[PDB]
Each structure stands twice: as structure tokens, then as C-alpha cells.
Write a protein that binds this ligand. Sequence first.
Ligand SMILES: Nc1nc2c(ncn2[C@@H]2O[C@H](COP(=O)(O)OP(=O)(O)CP(=O)(O)O)[C@@H](O)[C@H]2O)c(=O)[nH]1
Length: 402
Amino acid sequence: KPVVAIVGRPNVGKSTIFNRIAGERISRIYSSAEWLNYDFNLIDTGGPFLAQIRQQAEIAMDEADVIIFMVNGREGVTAADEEVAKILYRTKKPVVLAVNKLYDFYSLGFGEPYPISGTHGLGLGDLLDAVAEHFKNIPETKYNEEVIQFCLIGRPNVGKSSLVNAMLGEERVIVSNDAVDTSFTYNQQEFVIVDTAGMRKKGKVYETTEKYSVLRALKAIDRSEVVAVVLDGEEGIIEQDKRIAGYAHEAGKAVVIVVNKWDAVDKDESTMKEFEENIRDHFQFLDYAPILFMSALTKKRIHTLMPAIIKASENHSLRVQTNVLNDVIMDAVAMNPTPTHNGSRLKIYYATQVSVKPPSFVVFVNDPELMHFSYERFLENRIRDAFGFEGTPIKIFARARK
Ligand SMILES: Nc1nc2c(ncn2[C@@H]2O[C@H](COP(=O)(O)OP(=O)(O)CP(=O)(O)O)[C@@H](O)[C@H]2O)c(=O)[nH]1
């Protein structure tokens, strides 16, 4: 059922590898070979220089679910490879990097490079595990890539439906028209609210336990890129709130914290500040998440919601230039020298971004064991000051050369 495409510039070995993994055409589409302990389909995308590659990658991004990006080892990172790379940045679909005919392929921004040789198929098993690992996250409801998908989550009666209503009443919104999702544009940009139906549940059904509502909300997050955590300003914070937010975080989604029912709280300057501090103390792992106070009922500050979601989404998607990132790491190191761990002091040789949604970074080191979690936090903070990243978690992995 899953579909795999091979993308690269010409003379890299696409046809060899492709013919190797292709079984027979179906009736262009080929299914996978018999020798593979893996079931999937391939799509051929082959037949100016930048304009023909433009066609291929486009076709893959629409048709394929997982894309293999092929470069040439013996040559290396050619500027021609760097162009194809730039094209593929245009997709939220998974890309695995293959290096044919076989160390700053990391400096192409797709993470670990999988060496192969279409000779006696060396390295192919690792390549296919990476490719296949994505098959489970293949969305069931598929939207256009320009669409920004988000969900609202929070306990019974926080005002999810009401916040939605209030959002959709603004002059800037045009609502369209799975009978679970709501589509609309805002400043003519496309959005989908995941699983609005689930918010409108009772009225056809008695909720009798929360346990199914929880699990369904988890599937809505899996489907989103931004999660609005909505808290009741009147009744405060509870245990269930931490858990669902916990999941969102561990899943690497952008997060915005929404405090609804602000109208129903005794407000002076202090109460807002204390409620904010309260949230930072209960949700210690969400410091990157901004906090919006509003009221779905009075419409106070409700016009701040969509801008914040747009911003969290952008930061979730952001790609840094490597040169700037390395300036920033080395600046962090100068200001704050690295710790020892028994005679041996951590050294950082180089950093690259390996992926987006959420942004992830690899720093090449001395030895990964020497990098304390607290120093990791510190490097994360320095990257935040330099680039922004409000509204998204970020990941830093330490790896050894070599
Ligand atoms: N004071 C105040 N009350 C609100 C606000 N938003 C919603 N309410 C009230 O809270 C109750 C729940 O609103 P509702 O939109 O159904 O919350 P929900 O979370 O969508 C309901 P479910 O949990 O079933 O999905 C309603 O009585 C509504 O009038 C608000 O901003 N301020």
C-alpha cells in the first residue's frame, strides 16, 4: 500500500537501485521485489537541467509517501545535489538520504546518510529499514501540503467548541462549505482543525468515562502539527492536563497554551502573572510554549489565537543556515567552556540541522557520553536566543565522528 519514490540528479544510479527493488508493474507503478521481506509499491519518475529535476521531485512529493534522495559518493556533494535538496525542503513527507557507489552529506540536511552500492547490494537492508520505519506514520486522511493542521485539546467543558466558533467569526476567516475535520482560510491561508466532530460528541452520546476521549485526542495530536492546549482559567489546572500536553511534547508538536474563561476570573495585574507562573511550574517541559489569555464568550483577545498558531507552525518548520548555527554553537562554547567527566573535556567539532517538524540538530563531538544533559539544555537555550523557535520543541543529539 505505501509508495516509495527515488529522487536524484542524473547519473547517480537511480535505475540500478530502482530495478533492484522493483518487482513487476501493476495495471508508472511497480510493486516491490520478492526477495524483500517488505511489501510496497514504487513509482518511476525519470524522464534545461534544474527544470527536469524540478518535474521529478514535484511528482514524487505528490505521489510518494516516502522519498529516497540519491546522491553520488565517488563525486560527493555537488552544487547540483544542493539544488535538488533545496527543492525537497518543500515537503513535510519523509526523505531518506542514500549515498550510492560506496561525511558532510549531513550538510544536506536530511540526517543520517545511508551508504549503498548497487553492485552486490551492500547497505540496502539498512536503507529499507529506514524507509519502512515511516510506513506506520503514513496519514490516513491526506491533505494538500500548503494546509496547516492543528487541534485543540483540554478537559470536558473548557470551551473548545466555543473557541472554535469565536475564531471562525472573524472578518479574516472564510469557512469552507471525513466529516470530522473543519477547513477554512485565514488571510487566505488554508487550515484544517483536526477532529472538530470529537469536540461535538455529547448531544448524540453519553460520555461515561474519559478513557476513550483521552485516546481519541491522542490520535488528533498525531494528526496535527500544532496543538493548542486549552486550560480553564476559572477551575485551574488538573492531572489529566499535564499528561496530554506531556504526550504532545514527547511527540515533537508545536504547542500553544490557551487559558480560556479569562472573563470569569477576578482580574488585576497580579492574577495574570501568577497564573502564568503557575503554568510554568506545572508544565516545566513547555517553556517554549507561549501563553494566551482569552475569552470565547466575550471575544477578548481571541484575535490573537490564529497569529500564534501561524507563528508556532512556522517555527516548527524552520531551517537554519549551517554557517550561522556553527557560529552560534562556537559562541556558546566560548561564553561557557565545556565540562570534564574524568580527565577528558568534551569537544564539539561541528553542528548541523538534520530535520524539521520539530527542528533537530546533531552536534559532532569528541565522545557523546561526555555531553551532560544540562549542557544540552544550555546549547538549546543559545540556539533559541539566536533564531527564535518560540512554540516548538527542539532536539539536540550528540554523535561521534565516527
Ligand atoms: N465565562 C466563560 N464561559 C465559557 C467560555 N467559553 C465557554 N464557556 C462555557 O463553558 C461551557 C462549555 O463550553 P463548550 O464550548 O461546550 O466546551 P467544550 O470543551 O467544547 C464541550 P466538550 O468537552 O463536550 O467538547 C459552556 O457552558 C460555555 O457557555 C468563556 O470564554 N467564558
